[PDB]
Enzyme design. Structure first.
Site, PDB file in Angstrom:
ATOM      1  N   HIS A  43       6.449  20.825 -34.915  1.00 47.09           N
ATOM      2  CA  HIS A  43       7.585  20.179 -35.372  1.00 47.09           C
ATOM      3  C   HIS A  43       8.200  21.014 -36.523  1.00 47.09           C
ATOM      4  CE1 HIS A  43       5.108  18.095 -38.655  1.00 47.09           C
ATOM      5  NE2 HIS A  43       6.399  18.346 -39.349  1.00 47.09           N
ATOM      6  N   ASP A  99       0.688  18.832 -31.961  1.00 47.35           N
ATOM      7  CA  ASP A  99       1.531  19.265 -32.909  1.00 47.35           C
ATOM      8  C   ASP A  99       1.056  20.568 -33.443  1.00 47.35           C
ATOM      9  OD1 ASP A  99       3.725  19.559 -34.529  1.00 47.35           O
ATOM     10  OD2 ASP A  99       3.213  17.816 -35.831  1.00 47.35           O
ATOM     11  N   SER A 198       4.353  19.533 -44.055  1.00 44.33           N
ATOM     12  CA  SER A 198       4.275  19.654 -42.510  1.00 44.33           C
ATOM     13  C   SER A 198       3.547  21.288 -42.378  1.00 44.33           C
ATOM     14  CB  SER A 198       5.658  19.745 -41.995  1.00 44.33           C
ATOM     15  OG  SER A 198       5.849  18.209 -41.801  1.00 44.33           O
TER      16      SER A 198
HETATM   17  C1  LIG Z   1       6.759  10.013 -38.187  1.00 47.23           C
HETATM   18  C2  LIG Z   1       7.694  10.459 -38.985  1.00 47.23           C
HETATM   19  N1  LIG Z   1       7.660   9.523 -40.218  1.00 47.23           N
HETATM   20  S1  LIG Z   1       9.087   9.469 -41.215  1.00 47.23           S
HETATM   21  O1  LIG Z   1       9.777  10.700 -41.191  1.00 47.23           O
HETATM   22  O2  LIG Z   1       8.573   9.220 -42.505  1.00 47.23           O
HETATM   23  C3  LIG Z   1      10.060   8.460 -40.697  1.00 47.23           C
HETATM   24  C4  LIG Z   1       9.334   7.222 -40.603  1.00 47.23           C
HETATM   25  C5  LIG Z   1       8.993   6.123 -41.854  1.00 47.23           C
HETATM   26  C6  LIG Z   1       8.752   5.060 -41.775  1.00 47.23           C
HETATM   27  C7  LIG Z   1       8.045   4.557 -40.532  1.00 47.23           C
HETATM   28  C8  LIG Z   1       8.087   5.305 -39.404  1.00 47.23           C
HETATM   29  C9  LIG Z   1       8.854   6.513 -39.233  1.00 47.23           C
HETATM   30  C10 LIG Z   1       6.915  11.627 -39.531  1.00 47.23           C
HETATM   31  O3  LIG Z   1       6.214  11.743 -40.067  1.00 47.23           O
HETATM   32  N2  LIG Z   1       7.702  12.944 -39.001  1.00 47.23           N
HETATM   33  C11 LIG Z   1       8.917  12.915 -37.950  1.00 47.23           C
HETATM   34  C12 LIG Z   1       8.952  14.216 -37.708  1.00 47.23           C
HETATM   35  C13 LIG Z   1       8.228  15.065 -39.116  1.00 47.23           C
HETATM   36  C14 LIG Z   1       7.256  14.385 -39.507  1.00 47.23           C
HETATM   37  C15 LIG Z   1       6.949  14.375 -40.813  1.00 47.23           C
HETATM   38  O4  LIG Z   1       7.554  14.044 -41.615  1.00 47.23           O
HETATM   39  N3  LIG Z   1       5.723  14.728 -41.137  1.00 47.23           N
HETATM   40  C16 LIG Z   1       5.314  15.289 -42.721  1.00 47.23           C
HETATM   41  C17 LIG Z   1       4.450  14.191 -43.157  1.00 47.23           C
HETATM   42  C18 LIG Z   1       2.986  14.451 -42.778  1.00 47.23           C
HETATM   43  C19 LIG Z   1       1.803  13.573 -43.121  1.00 47.23           C
HETATM   44 CL1  LIG Z   1       0.445  13.759 -42.823  1.00 47.23          CL
HETATM   45  C20 LIG Z   1       2.158  12.493 -43.875  1.00 47.23           C
HETATM   46  C21 LIG Z   1       3.496  12.328 -44.345  1.00 47.23           C
HETATM   47  C22 LIG Z   1       4.733  13.155 -43.888  1.00 47.23           C
HETATM   48  C23 LIG Z   1       6.244  12.773 -44.245  1.00 47.23           C
HETATM   49  N4  LIG Z   1       6.586  11.696 -43.348  1.00 47.23           N
END
Ligand SMILES: C[C@@H](NS(=O)(=O)Cc1ccccc1)C(=O)N1CCC[C@H]1C(=O)NCc1cc(Cl)ccc1CN
Ligand SMILES: *[C@@H]1O[C@H](CO)[C@@H](O)[C@H](O)[C@H]1NC(C)=O
Ligand code: NA
Ligand code: NA
Lengths: 251, 28, 11
Positions: A43, A99, A198
């Site tokens: 991603h 991923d 990420s």
């Molecule tokens: C699933 C998505 N969450 S998100 O961006 O915060 C949007 C979201 C918020 C609340 C509930 C559902 C969705 C997500 O994590 N994504 C969507 C595409 C990229 C990836 C990401 O941000 N990864 C970074 C990440 C990785 C980890 Cl292990 C923990 C937290 C984060 C930051 N959210």
């Protein structure tokens, strides 16, 4: 990284920063697995819902870094990308299943005190270490909270969580190619990856041979460091057959 | 390669970082 | 926000 601390110098010498050429900005974390190969999250390179589709010439990798923003003269090394390989069954449409991506460097990077590859797990090390309660370490230059940014690389140690607890923490479909980590609301301690982390590594130090292994890749989470939510990580060993196929074919 | 996962400023010099013991203690 | 990197890497 939320609720982590400043890394020590050379603490994570496999840490890689994916850097956008224009505008110049942090794109993601990644890790060094040999002198010519870098591992990251798919991603970081391909995510159509956010209009993300990077090609080789859009990016640089910066290796040996500590400071987030400084150009670390005589310490960091900057490499151009020869080719990107994304897992052919990467599921960006639904849940970020598989991923994972590899990047081949145009030229080998010289190892130093600050630049050194991490090990990838074999089946036995994975079986031994990927157990609920066992802790790994996540590193990155990502945001310090969900809603700012660190001066230097951040580090946090987090326990692997029982699969049913991972499953029950989210409405998203979890797969065998993911594991989750983080503290429970009742555990007091906290911490998580966040935006910008990420693609960075979840590592564990084997007590059998005292080497660091990359067990996970920072993949996804509902927000950052939310109570009752967990971070989800790509299960590196489960996808190691693909990793080896790519390196054997294109290496 | 054969040297993977051994940090020049830590394992290679038999120095420990400040929190790796937290990891070891969790590996019960 | 980021310090400029040597131009050699941007060519
Ligand atoms: C699933 C998505 N969450 S998100 O961006 O915060 C949007 C979201 C918020 C609340 C509930 C559902 C969705 C997500 O994590 N994504 C969507 C595409 C990229 C990836 C990401 O941000 N990864 C970074 C990440 C990785 C980890 Cl292990 C923990 C937290 C984060 C930051 N959210
Ligand atoms: C992403 O970019 C490539 C070409 O650069 C394109 O062919 C592809 O359709 C785009 N979307 C993907 C792979 O989902
Ligand atoms: Na659920
Ligand atoms: Na949480």
């Amino acid at each position: 990284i939320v609720e982590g601390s400043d890394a020590e110098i050379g603490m994570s010498p496999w840490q890689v920063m994916l850097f956008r050429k224009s505008p110049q900005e942090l794109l993601c974390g990644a890790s060094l697995i040999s002198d010519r190969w870098v591992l990251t999250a798919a991603h970081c390179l391909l995510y159509p819902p956010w209009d993300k589709n990077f090609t080789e010439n859009d990016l640089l990798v910066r290796i040996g870094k500590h400071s987030r923003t400084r150009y670390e003269r005589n310490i960091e090394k900057i490499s151009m990308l020869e080719k990107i390989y994304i897992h052919p069954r990467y599921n960006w449409r639904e849940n970020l299943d598989r991923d994972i991506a590899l990047m081949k460097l145009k030229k080998p990077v010289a190892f130093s005190d600050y630049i050194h590859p991490v090990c990838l797990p074999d089946r036995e090390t994975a079986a031994s270490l990927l157990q609920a309660g066992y802790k790994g370490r996540v590193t990155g230059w990502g945001n310090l909270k969900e809603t700012g940014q660190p001066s230097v690389l951040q580090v946090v140690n987090l326990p692997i969580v029982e699969r049913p607890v991972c499953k029950d923490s989210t409405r998203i479909r979890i797969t065998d190619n993911m594991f989750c980590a983080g503290y429970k609301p009742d555990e007091g301690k906290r911490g998580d990856a966040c935006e910008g982390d990420s693609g960075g590594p979840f590592v564990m130090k084997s007590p059998f041979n005292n080497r660091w292994y990359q067990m996970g890749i920072v993949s996804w989470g509902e927000g950052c460091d939310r109570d009752g939510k967990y971070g989800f990580y790509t299960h590196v060993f489960r996808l190691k057959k693909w990793i080896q196929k790519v390196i054997d074919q294109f290496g | 390669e054969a040297d993977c996962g051994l940090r020049p400023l830590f394992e290679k010099k038999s120095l420990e970082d400040k929190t790796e013991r937290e990891l070891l203690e969790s590996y019960i | 926000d980021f310090e400029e990197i040597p131009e050699e890497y941007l060519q």
